[PDB]
Amino acid sequence: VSLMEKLKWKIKCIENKFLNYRLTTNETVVAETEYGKVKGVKRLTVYDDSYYSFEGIPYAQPPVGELRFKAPQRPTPWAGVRDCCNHKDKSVQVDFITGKVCGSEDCLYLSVYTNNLNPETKRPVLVYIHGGGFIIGENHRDMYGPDYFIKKDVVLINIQYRLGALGFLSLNSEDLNVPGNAGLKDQVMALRWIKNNCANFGGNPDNITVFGESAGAASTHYMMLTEQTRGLFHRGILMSGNAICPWANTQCQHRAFTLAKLAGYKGEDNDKDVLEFLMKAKPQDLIKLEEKVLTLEERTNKVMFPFGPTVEPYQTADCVLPKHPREMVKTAWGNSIPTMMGNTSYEGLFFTSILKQMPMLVKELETCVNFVPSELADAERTAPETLEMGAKIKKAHVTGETPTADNFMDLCSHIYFWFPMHRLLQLRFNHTSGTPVYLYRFDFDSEDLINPYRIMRSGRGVKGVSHADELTYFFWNQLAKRMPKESREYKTIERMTGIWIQFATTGNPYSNEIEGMENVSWDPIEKSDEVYKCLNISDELKMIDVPEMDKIKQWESMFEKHRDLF
Numbered sequence: 136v137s138l139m140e141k142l143k144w145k146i147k148c149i150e151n152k153f154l155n156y157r158l159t160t161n162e163t164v165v166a167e168t169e170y171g172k173v174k175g176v177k178r179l180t181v182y183d184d185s186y187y188s189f190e191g192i193p194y195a196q197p198p199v200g201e202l203r204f205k206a207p208q209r210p211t212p213w214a215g216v217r218d219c220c221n222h223k224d225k226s227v228q229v230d231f232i233t234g235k236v237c238g239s240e241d242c243l244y245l246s247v248y249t250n251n252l253n254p255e256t257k258r259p260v261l262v263y264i265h266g267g268g269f270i271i272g273e274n275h276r277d278m279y280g281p282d283y284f285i286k287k288d289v290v291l292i293n294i295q296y297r298l299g300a301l302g303f304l305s306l307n308s309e310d311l312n313v314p315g316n317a318g319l320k321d322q323v324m325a326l327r328w329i330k331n332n333c334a335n336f337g338g339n340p341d342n343i344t345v346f347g348e349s350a351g352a353a354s355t356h357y358m359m360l361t362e363q364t365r366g367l368f369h370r371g372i373l374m375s376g377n378a379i380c381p382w383a384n385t386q387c388q389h390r391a392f393t394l395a396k397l398a399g400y401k402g403e404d405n406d407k408d409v410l411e412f413l414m415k416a417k418p419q420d421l422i423k424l425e426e427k428v429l430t431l432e433e434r435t436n437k438v439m440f441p442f443g444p445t446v447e448p449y450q451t452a453d454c455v456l457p458k459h460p461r462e463m464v465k466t467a468w469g470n471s472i473p474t475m476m477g478n479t480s481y482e483g484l485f486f487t488s489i490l491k492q493m494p495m496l497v498k499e500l501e502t503c504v505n506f507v508p509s510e511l512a513d514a515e516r517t518a519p520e521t522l523e524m525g526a527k528i529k530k531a532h533v534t535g536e537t538p539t540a541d542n543f544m545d546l547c548s549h550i551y552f553w554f555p556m557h558r559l560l561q562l563r564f565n566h567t568s569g570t571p572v573y574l575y576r577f578d579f580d581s582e583d584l585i586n587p588y589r590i591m592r593s594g595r596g597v598k599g600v601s602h603a604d605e606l607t608y609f610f611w612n613q614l615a616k617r618m619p620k621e622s623r624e625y626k627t628i629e630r631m632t633g634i635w636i637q638f639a640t641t642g643n644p645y646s647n648e649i650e651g652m653e654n655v656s657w658d659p660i661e662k663s664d665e666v667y668k669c670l671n672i673s674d675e676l677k678m679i680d681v682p683e684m685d686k687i688k689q690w691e692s693m694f695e696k697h698r699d700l701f
């Protein structure tokens with residue numbers, strides 16, 4: 136990204152540190168945990184609110200040395216008081232702005248926030264899992280500030296977990312104990328920590344809500360799908376993603392050799408020898424080369440990331456994905472806790488920057504064969520079927536006659552978000568307690584208040600509600616500002632945090648006490664529903680038929696002759 140945003144980022148980083156100092160108080164405090172006592176500190180917000188802040192709480196031992204690529208291990212307990220008045224480093228990743236690798240293998244921490252350490256009642260516990268394609272992201276408050284949430288009486292917790300190769304390497308060989316999904320297992324162990332530790336911070340361990348956006352939504356869903364976590368939490372919110380989005384899973388067992396060879400491995404394709412090499416490599420080296428691992432073929436079949444959540448090739452004590460996520464839904468304990476799901480009104484706008492550098496992508500819409508679900512597509516995407524299935528995609532998204540960039544981004548909304556949501560709901564309904572799932576559609580557009588994701592997708596001046604635009608209304612970030620309390624932006628912040636806290640508290644997102652919601656009557660989806668209804672969140676809160684419904688059904692019709700695969 137341009138030098139100009141790099142210099143502006145540097146300064147906004149320069150501001151964020153002085154401001155972070157300015158909003159601490161000299162009030163320090165100490166909480167008990169099962170692994171030892173922790174020293175927090177009270178902080179302020181631009182809205183003159185205050186909250187206790189505990190950052191850098193380890194829930195696992197540092198996945199370094201021999202622990203790299205392995206499932207996480209219980210951290211080592213301490214006497215005395217561990218300092219938690221500051222945040223730890225982020226997972227090793229490529230900074231999208233600097234271009235350079237940053238972060239650390241020592242990254243397995245969570246941050247706990249609450250306005251009152253001694254509440255009159257035990258509070259609902261909200262656990263956020265950040266997105267970023269399982270390759271970027273942080274729990275640092277410069278991107279995920281708890282400032283909006285702590286206005287209300289809850290305990291908010293943001294976790295970190297290993298990213299990219301270091302989190303999701305997977306080897307076919309049972310001897311080596313790298314089945315995969317380390318990053319997910321970080322999450323499992325962190326949730327296990329929260330269930331055993333939130334009460335110490337004033338949180339009701341019997342009322343825990345896990346939520347995340349994008350890869351954090353996928354992650355939340357995985358945490359709802361895996362037997363490792365049954366009964367850990369009690370509500371789930373999937374923001375713009377779930378476990379069966381095609382970008383949320385990959386069979387990457389063969390990609391460990393390619394990474395090694397990119398890193399200069401000399402030798403043969405042997406799981407043991409590849410691992411021995413990857414074990415000694417510099418972390419920054421593997422992570423930076425990660426961008427080169429996918430073949431031209433993979434990219435063409437829309438494989439988004441080389442390493443990510445995977446179906447583990449052999450079971451272990453800590454295994455998390457023994458079968459395909461579509462399969463794991465069958466017996467998913469999470470099918471039977473209140474669920475809320477949603478997408479933004481223009482998800483695909485997220486790919487603007489990628490289109491800019493590769494406008495030839497738009498030419499893929501002339502037949503759309505490359506977007507047919509891979510499980511239905513033939514290898515060459517030349518079969519007449521594949522062309523007929525593609526025509527269905529084309530009919531649904533190509534509006535003129537030479538396909539456009541907007542058509543392309545409109546298509547992306549469905550292949551990556553709306554259609555996997557549909558498949559999930561339909562799949563889940565056959566295997567459920569009858570527990571309610573609620574839909575929202577985030578449709579609020581503004582540039583008065585943004586977040587860094589807008590810079591990454593080149594969305595400056597750009598209208599429409601992109602993937603991740605709603606994060607602005609949930610978390611403080613270093614590009615934000617104090618808004619007038621009568622502004623539409625400030626109003627959305629109250630609404631979004633309101634409904635999220637309402638749903639967390641009660642398993643039902645509706646409350647008459649949330650402004651703009653008096654005439655709302657928000658029903659969940661029922662198995663018998665022909666048409667999904669959703670709370671559309673704009674300047675007005677309005678229950679509507681999901682506008683994307685006709686296109687969703689159009690995608691579903693590709694499965695006409697292959698209903699078992701739907």
Ligand SMILES: *B(O)c1cc(Br)cc(N2CCCC2)c1
Binds near residue numbers: 265267268439551
């Ligand atoms: B959400 O975590 C997410 C979804 C998609 Br689809 C793509 C991404 N990327 C793309 C490049 C880094 C972030 C994230």
